[PDB]
Amino acid sequence: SRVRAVFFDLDNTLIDTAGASRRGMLEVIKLLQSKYHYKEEAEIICDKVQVKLSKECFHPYNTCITDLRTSHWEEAIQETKGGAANRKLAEECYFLWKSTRLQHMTLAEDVKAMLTELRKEVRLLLLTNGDRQTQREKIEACACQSYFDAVVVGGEQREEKPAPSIFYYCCNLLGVQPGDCVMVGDTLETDIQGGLNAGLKATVWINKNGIVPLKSSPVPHYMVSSVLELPALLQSIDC
């Protein structure tokens, strides 16, 4: 009845993806406004891209995603500004956005110290959705793979969260039973729903911003604001 494995989301759970991604946007705005003499049109372009990205995370992706997310910019520039297509400016914007966010994707020192002290009591797995190319780059950017007994990327797999199969696979990977695992993540629709679907021992929601969820949304077993609260939490579930 003791916890034998803990699964961890990556984005906005272990690394500040959102903060990093907006930092990239800020640089793109800084670029367009200063260099290419833009005003408030730049901020509109970034919003269009941001919503374009959301309507593309559909699974199972195809590659090259680079060509896709780059096209997301040229489609965005033309809508706000206008004129002929500018693949060069789109290429610049994307890689500036990409290079910026990846450098800000790092594991905090106290987060590293938490993961290190935790894997000597339970096994650790990294369970993240997204395409192979994009996610693996993040993994390398924050060098987290060294901290986990296993890493599983949804794009590389048959199904992602919240589908229970990918959870069952993680369990087989570590030779454990779903009832011995706890899922930790910050998205209800994937991390939490998935944990409930796959009958895991517990689900832990990361809610630092203090969202009050709808009654119809998945209900976690636990709710905390930081991943630093797990050791005490996991010790209370008895491990």
The annotated binding site is made up of 9-11, 128-129, 161, 186
Distance CA 2, CA 193 (A): 22
C-alpha pair distances (Å), 210 with each of 12, 187, 203, 206, 223: 14, 13, 17, 9, 10
Least spacing, CB of residue 190 vs ligand VO4, in Å = 6
User: With contact defined as beta carbons under 8 Å apart, do 30 and 55 qualify?
Assistant: no
Find the DSSP H helices in the chain: 17-34, 41-54, 65-80, 87-104, 109-118, 132-142, 164-173, 193-197, 230-236
Rule CB under 6 A: is residue 16 a binding residue for ligand VO4? no
Q: Which is nearer to Mg ion, 9 or 92 (CB)?
A: 9
Q: Which is nearer to ligand VO4, 15 or 49 (CB)?
A: 15
* Partner touching 152 among ligand VO4, Mg ion, none, CB below 5 to 8 Å by kind: none
User: With contact defined as beta carbons under 8 Å apart, do 24 and 96 qualify?
Assistant: yes
With CB under 6 A, what is the number of residues at the site for ligand VO4? 11
Figure out which of the listed residues 21, 100, 129, 193 binds ligand VO4, where binding follows CB under 6 A.
Answer: 129
Q: Residue positions in the annotated binding site for Mg(2+)? A: 9, 11, 186
Rule CB under 6 A: is residue 190 a binding residue for ligand VO4? yes
Q: Give me the residues that bind ligand VO4 (CB under 6 A), please.
A: 9-13, 128-130, 185, 187, 190
